[PDB]
Structure formats: C-alpha cells, structure tokens
C-alpha cells in the first residue's frame, strides 16, 4: 500500500465518519464529535468520486445534517468543518461554513458511499449555549484621555493602501496625502487590530489619537524616529519634504480630546458583544463554563480599552507599535499570552500573561511602554517575544492529580491531554502492589521511575510504602527520592504503622497519605484518628467507597489535622453510581455475590448515603481536593471534568452558595478549581512552584475554549513551552483540518520535557543530590512545609463540620443536620463531547 502517515490518519477519520453514519442511520441525534467526523468524511468521499469542485462541496457540506439530526448544542458548537482530500487536480482544502443550516439534512448525501439504508426523517426523536458570553447591552469607549484630530486622507497611489490601528500615522505610505504635521505622534482611533483601507483615489476622513506612554516613535519609514517633541517634529517635517511623502496642510482640521462622552465626535465606540468577539470578555461580562450551569463573571480587567495586544497581519504587535523597539534585550518577555480570561482560586480576571525563563513573570497589561500607558517593565513585548493568542479563551493552572497509581505510561498521556501537568502518587508499573496502592517501594524502583519519567513534560512526585512499624526502611525510600509515603490497608494500616509513619514524616517534612482499615480489624475510625496524635495527614478517598473504615471514615472531614481528598468515580452521585461501584468492588476484591459475608462486606463499603454526603461536603468546602485513583478505582482523564460535574450538580440541586453573588457563580467556581490546583500543591509541599496562575510560579498553563471548558482543552503549556495541543492533519495547508486530535508537541521530544519540569523529592534526597546520582535532566526540588498544615490551610475548602454517621443506617449528619442530595440522572461535560 505504501501508506504515508496522512493516509493512515485519514483512514481513522473515515472510520469515525462511518460510525457516525451507522448511528445516524438508526436515528441517533449526533453529537458535535460525530457530526464533524461525518461531514469531514463525506467531503473526502465526494472528492474521491471526482465529480464535484471545492466550491460545490463548500455548499454540499451544509446540507448533510439538519438541526433534527444533531443534539441541541451542535449548531452552537459547530461553526465550521475543514478537511483536505485528493481531488482530480490534487490535494485541496474544503471548509464547510455553518454546516447545520436546515431543519432536516439530505440524508442520502449524509450517507453517500456508506451503503447504509437512509432513515425516514421521523426516526429522529424530538437547550443552553455552551460557553456563551453574556454582556450588558452597551458601548465601551476607546482610547479615552488623548489628544485627537480629524484629518482628510487622500490616496494618490495606484494600488490599495491599508493602515493598522497602531501604526504611527506620519510613517504611512508616501502616496497618502494629508496633514503630516497634525499626524505626528498620532495613530488611528479605531478598534485595536483593525485597519482603514484606501483604494486608489479614495478620500476618507479619519480620527487620530495621540500615542501615549513615553511617546516615542520608532520604525515605519524612519520619518519621525524619536521621542515626540518640537525638535523631532521639525526634523520629521524636513524628512517628509525631502523624501516626497504626501503632505498638505489642513489648517481647519477639527482638534480636541477623547473622553467619556457618548456625543464627542472624536470618540470611537465598540459594543460589548463585538468587544468580546475580538478580545474576549471584560469586566462584568459572564461566561458559561462548558455546557454546565455555572457562570463566571470577569471581576477586573487590566486592559486599557483600545490598546489591546492582538497579533496578526496589520495588527498591534508589530515593530515600534505594540512590540517595543529599544528596551534592554534581557527584559523582553519570552512569551506573552494575550487577552486571557484567567480562572484561578485567586480570582476570575482578564489580563495578559508574561512568561520568562519558564516562569509566570507578570500578569497584567502587556505591550510597548513607548506608545501605551500602563505597561510595567516586566510586561514588555520585544523582538524576541513569542505570542500565544488568548483572546476568547480561558486560561487555568495545570491540574495536579495527587492520587496517581503509576500502573502504565499511557495514563500519563491521558492525564496531560486532559489538562493535568503534575502527578503525585506511587507505583512501578502494573505489578499487583501498584495496582492496589500508590507505592514505589524499593529504592531501586524509585531510581528507575525517576529515570523512566525524566523526559516526560510533567512534574512528578513518587511516594513510598509507609506501612511499617519501624522507621528504618522508611528512611531509605525517602533518601532515595520519595516525597511522601502511603499507608494502605493492603500493606497494613494499623495504629502501630500509622504512628511510626507519622513520626517519620515529622522528621522528614513530607506528607503522609492514608487509605485506612476498612475491615476495622485493629480498630474503628476513632482509633486511627487517635493514632494520628494530632499530626498532619492526607486522607485519600475520604468518603470511603475507594477504601476506609466502614461505614464511617468520612468522619475525618471534620478533623482539624486532616487534609481530606475525594477520588473521582463517585463524583457526583448519579443514577448508575451504586450499581457500578458495587460491581467494581466485587471485581477488584474477587468477591462472590452468592456468599453472604462477601456481599455484606460490599454493602458496608459502597453506600449511597455517604456518597451523597460527599457531594455536599465537597460543595461546602469540607473536602479540599479531588484526585483520580488512576486505574485503581478512578479515572486519570476525569479529575477536572468530575470536579465541574460535582459543582454543576450541587448548583442545580441547592442553588448559589451562601457566599455566592446571584449574578454569578464565582465563589463556587473558585472553591472547586482549588480542589485540583492549589490544594494538592499545598498538601504535598510544593505550592511555591505550581498550583496557581501567580507570578513567580512555573508557567504550567492550560488554554480552553469556553464551550469546551472542563472537558477538552486546546493547548497545554508546560514550563512556558507547548507540551500537548489540538492539531489536525499534519500534511494540511493549515493546522485545523480533520482529524483534529490532542497530540504531543515539541515539549515531548528529546530531553525538552526535563527542561520544562520538576521532579519533587524529599529534602533528604536532595541533600545527597539524587538528581546527580541518577543522571536526571529534569530539575529537582525538595518538598517542604507540610507538617504544620491543618484543614484551615486548604484554600476555600477549610470547613470543619462535626460529622456523625449512624453505624446501622449510614445516615450522615454535619453539625447535627442531615446531609442529603438526590442522585442526578445526567451530568454535563459528557454526552455533548465524547465519541464513546
């Protein structure tokens, strides 16, 4: 066959299309992913037939699927479908714009080439715009507080001339004629990144405003190089004349100032709707998170309207304009993320993000201090600065999963593709010990796992086996590189082991993670709590389905020295949760439905009442962290989605939180994002490095389209370099034609991954330079400051309700009041997005 990589890829696309076709043929209303697969595959197939042009297929593609053949969200999610195929005249790109354009599609065309029977239209069974921006019906005023002038500009050229918003107007093409003197130090008063076009012979009046900041002109034609002043004005006019740049005095040109006034002729306005389309939303606007019920409101914006940093042809980030020409090379940003909506436990804000040496260097207003106000010296875009376009997108910290079983490498790829950039847990591969527990037991394995993962662009921490009554071996795994220890009932979670392990932690400044004695063999939950002796400990899967004293481990959520996490699969309580978990447990534990004691054990551990309580405890901030339990009772690619599904369920069933405004869900949003960002980092002792979008931390950042927030990110940035991203056909003319998949980027090749990341180890291990001993390229840092933590140190999740659990009925109360929530029948961030 001599298949090239692109042929192999297009075959997969076709297979996805055929799956969508079979589904359509039985009357399934297709989701976004299926609709894209079908439309793209059909374009390829019509290209194969060789009877239709690109132009014809641009139209045909709009007729394949109607509103009735797709889910309600699809016409909102699907703006275009692109694919390339081999026509009789070679490879061509087809873009199908606005493909869901009719009530019912031409299903014979949708099924062309499939040999499937065409279904009657009545086979398709009879809301909410994902990622919607909500804004007040009003205008923003651009560029306020500046000198302004209106000038007549005439083209004497024979070819078109188009001038961008931030181009120094005196520097334009000599074949434009206008008052060059009045244009000195001015630029167009138009939306940032837009332009004014002059066809040959055109005369247009334009409004100009003064450049600001230091007011220094650089670049262009070098007509008026230098600070704006009287000397440099006269020099500029001398050059205008000497070089024959079109100039005509306009003595009576209107002059004034811009200000907040809706009637001022010098002003330029832009509606909030159009503003959000160009730059993303601004202060007071709201954004729907994915297809959830949650609305995030922009709390503040560092933008000065009119000076937005947008990159592109004719746009703002260009030499002498938004790109600074003359500052010290060493202070240029390495990368700027422009116009980001940042969602973080610290706030929901709008800002540019500056990255330098892999760190978040600055958050605020970026650009060029020579022409813009408000640009600090740590946010300068220079010649040596890359641009990532954040406008219209949400940026969050990379997620931190701190209950990882290192069962296989493939879960690492699944994790980062979902937006996780730090993994903490234990294991050696798919050995029984690791399949059960987060433990890398031997110093030999600690070395091998650090070496194995050295080129992967994630931060890693490995935990040893803490289940021992003597300290001797624990010291060894810690000095070998462990940054924590796991106490697990499968290795023994007895009071003697608990006490010994915590004593070790007090010495070594590492966190202890515990899965308690489900069997109550050595004691009940109160006896394990006693063994903690008031010392800091992280309780895994605190609700207990994932393990722990039956039936009342969840009591730990009210203990001050406990940092409690949930694992994902119980999040939130839904129709299938209990049946699913009961069988999962019996499979994991090799239990027999027909042996009473086995069934008694299973029912003692999988409990609707405690899982329902877990929904509420998460919502009120009494559970502080959400984690995976990857391939050992949980799902590595669903840490983020399960967190948001929980928040959505609780909003639906209980309304806004007490501390919530009712114009938005900001408090709930901040509380929940903390569960997979900052709190895992605090609990494990590396919060100075990662866990939030804050200056000085590693630039581990994830970019999301609001319509896909919480499910499928666009791009994962690790230490300031793109590590994984959505990319289409590698042979295509542009990066977006099908099939679009999450793929590894340059941060995954060679040893780049180590340069972008950190392996977290104990101080004892760093004291002997374990990175040198093991030949690691990845940076190593010691964990610290984890033995004086309490629940109060868990950001936005510091609640300590007194929890009781009825030993017979399993009824849970918090501060004497019943904790109940019904099961949900559906969740968002699911059916609208996934192919299977």
Among the listed residues 63, 508, 589, 590, the single catalytic one is 589
825 binds Na ion per the rule CB under 5 A = yes
Cα-trace Rg, the chain: 30
Q: Is 389 in the site for its own copies (CB under 8 A)?
A: yes
Which residue from 42, 69, 258, 335 is in contact with its own copies, where contact means CB under 8 A? 335
**Contacting range for Na ion; rule: CB under 5 A; set: 496-504, 682-690, 778-786, 823-831:** 823-831
Q: How far is CA 358 from CA 8, 317, 419, in A?
A: 36, 21, 18
Whole-number minimum distance, CB 604 to its own copies, in Å?
6
**Torsion angle in degrees (nearest 10) through CA of 106, 112, 115, 118:** 0
Structure tokens at 279: 């730059």
Gap between the Cα atoms of 609 and 820, Å rounded: 7
Binding mask 562-601 for its own copies (x = CB under 8 A): -------x----xxxx-xx--xx--xxx-------x--xx
Residue 8 interacts, among Na ion, its own copies, Ni ion, none and using kind-specific CB cut-offs from 5 to 8 Å, with its own copies
The span of 363-371, 395-403, 635-643, 760-768 binding its own copies (CB under 8 A) equals 635-643
Active site residue 589: yes
Q: How many Cα atoms within 13 Å fall on the side-chain side of residue 832?
A: 26
CB of 614 to its own copies, least distance (A): 15
Strand partners, 513: 486, 538
For 131: left if phi > 0, alpha if psi spans -120 to 50, otherwise beta; the answer is left
Q: Is 507 annotated as a binding residue?
A: no
**Does residue 790 contact residue 560 with C-beta atoms inside 8 Å?**
yes
**Is 76 flagged in the annotation as binding?**
no
Could you say which of 232, 442, 688, 790 contacts its own copies (CB under 8 A)? 442
**Residue among 50 and 807 whose Cβ is closer to Na ion:** 807
Residues in 683-722 at the binding interface with its own copies, rule: CB under 8 A: 708, 712, 715, 720-722
User: Is residue 97 a known part of a binding site?
Assistant: no
Helix, strand, coil proportions of the chain in percent (round to 5)? 30, 25, 45
Cα gap 645→652, rounded to integer Å: 11
Q: Which residue in the set 123, 174, 667, 763 belongs to the binding site for its own copies (CB under 8 A)?
A: 174
- For residue 735, the 8-state DSSP code is S
470 binds its own copies (CB under 8 A): yes
Helix locations, 665-738, DSSP H:
666-674, 678-684
Instruction: By CB under 8 A, tell whether 87 contacts its own copies.
Output: yes
Q: Which residues contact 159 (CB under 8 A, 6 or more apart)?
A: 200
Q: For residue 824, give the nearest of 622, 631, 639, 615 by alpha carbon.
A: 615
Structure tokens at 529: 């709590």
List Cβ neighbours of 709 (8 Å cut-off, separation of 6 or more): 131, 289, 290, 394, 644
Residues between 138 and 167 that touch Na ion (CB under 5 A): 159
d(CA 104, CA 111) in angstroms, rounded, equals 14
If one asks whether residue 380 binds its own copies (CB under 8 A), the answer comes out as no
Is residue 244 at the binding interface for its own copies, with CB under 8 A as the rule?
A: no
Return the exposure string of 529-568: e unless at least 16 CB atoms fall within 10 Å of the residue's CB, then b. bebbeebbbbbbbbbbbbbbbbbbbbbbbbbebbbbbbbb
Counting contacts by CB under 8 A, is residue 241 touching its own copies?
Answer: no
Please tell me the count of residues contacting its own copies according to CB under 8 A. Answer: 243
Task: State the burial class of residue 648 (Cβ atoms within 10 Å of its Cβ: 0-12, 13-18, 19+).
Answer: buried
Shortest distance in whole angstroms from residue 158 CB to Ni ion: 24
488 labeled part of a ligand binding site: yes
Quote the least distance from Cβ 66 to its own copies, whole Å.
Answer: 20
Residue where the block lists tokens 């200056």 = 695
Report the distance separating Cα 573 and Cα 826, nearest Å. Answer: 10
Minimal distance, residue 815 CB to Ni ion, in Å: 28
Give yes or no for residue 770 binding its own copies (CB under 8 A).
no
Nearest-10 crossing angle of helices 495-508, 472-480: 40
Q: Is-contact 382 401, C-beta < 8 A?
A: no
Tell me how long the chain is.
Answer: 836
Task: Indicate which single residue of 325, 599, 782, 820 sits in contact with its own copies (rule: CB under 8 A).
Answer: 325
Q: Which is nearer to its own copies, 655 or 730 (CB)?
A: 730
Site for its own copies in 670-689 (CB under 8 A): none
Output 306 or 548, the one with its CB closest to Ni ion. Answer: 548
The reply to whether 313 sits near its own copies by the rule CB under 8 A is yes
Could you tell me the smallest distance in angstroms from the CB atom of residue 735 to Ni ion? 12
> Phi and psi for 464 in degrees, rounded to 5?
-90, -175
Q: Taking CB under 5 A as the rule, does residue 809 contact Na ion?
A: no
- Which of 786, 824, 827, 829 binds Na ion (CB under 5 A)? It is 824
> How many Å is the maximal CA-CA distance in the chain?
101
Q: Quickly list DSSP for 9-39.
A: HHHHHHHHHHHHHHHHHTT--B-HHHHHHHH
Interface positions with Ni ion (CB under 5 A):
515, 546-547, 629, 632
CA 554 to chain centre: 31
The reply to whether 405 sits in an annotated binding site is yes
Candidates 18-26, 218-226, 338-346, 816-824; binding stretch for Na ion (CB under 5 A)? 816-824
Residues numbered 265-294 forming contacts with Na ion, rule: CB under 5 A: none
**CB-CB contact of 668 with 335 (8 Å):** no
Q: Please list the residues that pair with 247 across neighbouring strands.
A: 178
251 binds its own copies (CB under 8 A): no
x/- mask, its own copies, residues 269-308, rule CB under 8 A, reads ----------------------------------------
Which one of 106, 113, 132, 156 is in contact with its own copies (CB under 8 A)?
A: 113
Residue nearest to Ni ion (CB): 515
Return phi, psi of residue 380, to 5°: -90, 125
**629 in a labelled binding site:** yes
Q: Which is nearer to Na ion, 344 or 517 (CB)?
A: 517
Strand partners, 515: 488
Least distance from C-beta 308 to its own copies, angstroms? 14
Closer CB to Na ion, residue 775 or residue 807?
807
Identity of the residue, 120 or 825, whose beta carbon is nearer to Na ion in the bound complex: 825
Contact segment (CB under 8 A) with its own copies among 229-237, 264-272, 535-543, 545-553 equals 545-553
Secondary structure E strands in 32-89: 80-87
Stretch that binds its own copies, among 30-38, 60-68, 267-275, 668-676 (CB under 8 A): 30-38
Distances (CA, A) of 266 to 271, 383, 523, 545, 710: 17, 33, 79, 66, 43
**Of the residues 768, 807, 818, 835, which one makes contact with Na ion according to CB under 5 A:** 807
603 is in an annotated binding site: no
Site string for its own copies, 205-224 (x = CB under 8 A): -------------xxxxx--
Looking at residue 380, what DSSP letter applies? B
Interface with its own copies includes 128 (CB under 8 A)? no
Phi and psi, residue 454, nearest 5°: -60, -30
Is residue 811 a contact point for its own copies (CB under 8 A)?
no
The interface region with its own copies, picked from 66-74, 522-530, 675-683, 813-821 by CB under 8 A, is 522-530
Across-strand partners of 255?
A: 149
Query: Which one among 86, 154, 293, 378 touches its own copies, defined by CB under 8 A?
Result: 86
Beta strands in 374-510 (DSSP E): 386-389, 394-397, 399-405, 420-426, 459-465, 484-488
CB atoms closer than 10 angstroms to residue 363: 22
Subset of 722-751 contacting Na ion (CB under 5 A): none
Question: Looking only at residues 58 through 77 of this chain, which bind its own copies when binding is defined by CB under 8 A?
Answer: 58
List, as residue ranges, the binding site: 403, 405, 486, 488, 515, 541, 629
Residues that bind Na ion (CB under 5 A): 159, 807, 824-825
Annotation: binding site for Ni(2+): 403, 405, 486, 515, 541, 629
Question: What residues form the annotated binding site for substrate?
Answer: 488
What are the residue numbers of the active site?
589
């Amino acid at each position: 066959m001599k298949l090239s990589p692109r042929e192999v890829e297009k075959l997969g696309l076709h297979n996805a299309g055929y799956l969508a076709q079979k589904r359509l043929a039985r009357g399934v209303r297709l989701n976004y992913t299926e609709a894209v697969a079908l439309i793209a595959s059909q374009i390829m197939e019509y290209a194969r037939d060789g009877e239709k042009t690109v132009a014809q297929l641009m139209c045909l593609g709009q007729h394949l699927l109607g509103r009735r053949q797709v889910l309600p969200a699809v016409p909102h999610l699907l703006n275009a479908v692109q694919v390339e195929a081999t026509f009789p005249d070679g490879t061509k790109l087809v873009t199908v714009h606005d493909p869901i354009s009719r009530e019912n599609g031409e299903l014979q065309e949708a099924l062309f080439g499939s040999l499937l029977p065409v279904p009657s239209l009545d086979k398709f069974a009879e809301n909410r715009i994902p990622g919607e921006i909500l804004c007040e019906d009003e205008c923003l005023t651009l560029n306020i507080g500046r000198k302004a002038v209106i000038l007549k500009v005439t083209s004497k050229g024979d070819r078109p001339i188009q001038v961008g918003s931030h181009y120094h107007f005196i520097e334009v093409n000599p074949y434009l004629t206008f008052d060059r003197r009045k244009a000195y130090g001015m630029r167009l008063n138009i939306a940032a990144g837009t332009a004014v076009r002059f066809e040959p012979g055109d005369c247009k009046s334009v409004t100009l405003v003064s450049i600001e900041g230091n007011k220094v002109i650089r670049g262009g034609n070098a007509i008026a190089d230098g600070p704006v002043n009287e000397t440099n004005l006269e020099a500029a006019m001398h050059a205008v004349r000497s070089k024959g740049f079109g100039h005509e005095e306009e003595k009576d040109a209107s002059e004034g100032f811009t200000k907040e006034d809706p009637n001022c002729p010098f002003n330029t306005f832009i509606h909030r709707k159009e503003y959000a389309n160009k730059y993303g939303p601004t202060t007071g606007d709201k954004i729907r998170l994915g297809d959830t019920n949650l609305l995030a409101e922009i709390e503040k914006d560092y933008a000065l309207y009119g000076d937005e940093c947008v990159f592109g042809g004719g746009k703002v980030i260009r030499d002498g304009m938004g790109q600074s020409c003359g500052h010290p090379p060493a202070i240029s940003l390495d990368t700027v993320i422009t116009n980001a909506v940042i969602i973080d436990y610290t706030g929901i804000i709008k800002a540019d993000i500056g990255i330098k040496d892999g760190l978040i260097a600055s958050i605020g207003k970026a650009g060029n201090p020579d022409i813009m106000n408000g640009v600090f010296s740590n946010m300068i875009i220079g010649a040596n600065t890359e641009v990532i376009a954040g406008e219209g997108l949400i940026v969050t910290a990379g997620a931190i999963d701190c209950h990882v079983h290192y069962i296989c490498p493939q879960l690492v790829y699944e994790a980062i593709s979902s937006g996780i950039t730090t993994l903490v847990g234990g294991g050696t591969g798919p050995a029984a010990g690791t399949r059960a527990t987060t433990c890398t037991p031997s110093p030999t394995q600690m070395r091998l796992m650090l070496q194995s993962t050295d080129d992967l662009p994630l931060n890693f921490g490995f935990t040893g086996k803490g289940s021992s009554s003597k300290p001797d071996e624990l010291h060894e795994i810690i000095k070998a590189g462990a940054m924590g220890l796991k106490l697990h009932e499968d290795w023994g979670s007895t009071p003697a082991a608990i006490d010994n392990c915590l004593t070790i932690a007090e010495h070594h400044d590492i966190q202890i993670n515990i899965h308690t004695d489900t069997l109550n063999e050595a004691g009940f939950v109160e006896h394990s709590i006693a063994a903690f002796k008031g010392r800091t400990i992280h309780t895994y899967h605190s609700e207990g389905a994932g393990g722990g004293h039956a039936p009342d481990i969840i009591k730990v959520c009210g203990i001050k020295n406990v940092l409690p996490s949930s694992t994902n699969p119980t999040r939130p309580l839904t129709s299938n949760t209990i049946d699913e978990h009961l069988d999962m447990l019996m499979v994991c534990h090799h239990l027999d439905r027909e042996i009473p004691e086995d069934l008694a054990f299973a029912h003692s551990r999988i409990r609707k009442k405690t899982i329902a309580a877990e929904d509420v405890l998460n919502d009120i901030g009494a559970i502080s962290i959400i984690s995976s339990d990857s391939q050992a009772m949980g799902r590595v690619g669903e840490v983020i989605s399960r967190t948001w599904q929980t928040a959505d369920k609780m909003k639906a069933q209980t309304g806004p939180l007490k501390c919530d405004s009712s114009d938005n869900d900001n408090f709930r949003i901040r509380r929940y994002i903390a569960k997979y960002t900052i709190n895992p980092a605090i609990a494990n002792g590396f919060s100075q490095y990662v866990g939030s979008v804050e200056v000085g931390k590693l630039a581990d950042l994830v970019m999301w389209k609001p319509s896909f927030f919480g499910t499928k990110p666009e791009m994962v940035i690790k230490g300031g370099m793109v590590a994984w991203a959505d990319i289409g056909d590698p042979n295509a003319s542009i990066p977006t034609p099908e099939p679009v998949k999450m793929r590894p980027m340059y941060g995954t090749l060679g040893k780049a991954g180590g340069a972008l990341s950190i392996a977290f180890v104990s101080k004892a291990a760093l004291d002997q330079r374990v990175n040198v001993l093991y030949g690691l390229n990845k940076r190593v840092e010691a964990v610290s400051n984890v033995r004086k933590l309490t629940k109060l140190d868990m950001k936005l999740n510091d609640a300590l309700p007194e929890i009781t659990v009825d030993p017979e009925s399993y009824t849970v109360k918090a501060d004497g009041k019943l904790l109940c929530v019904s099961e949900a029948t559906t969740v968002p961030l699911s059916r609208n997005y996934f192919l299977f």
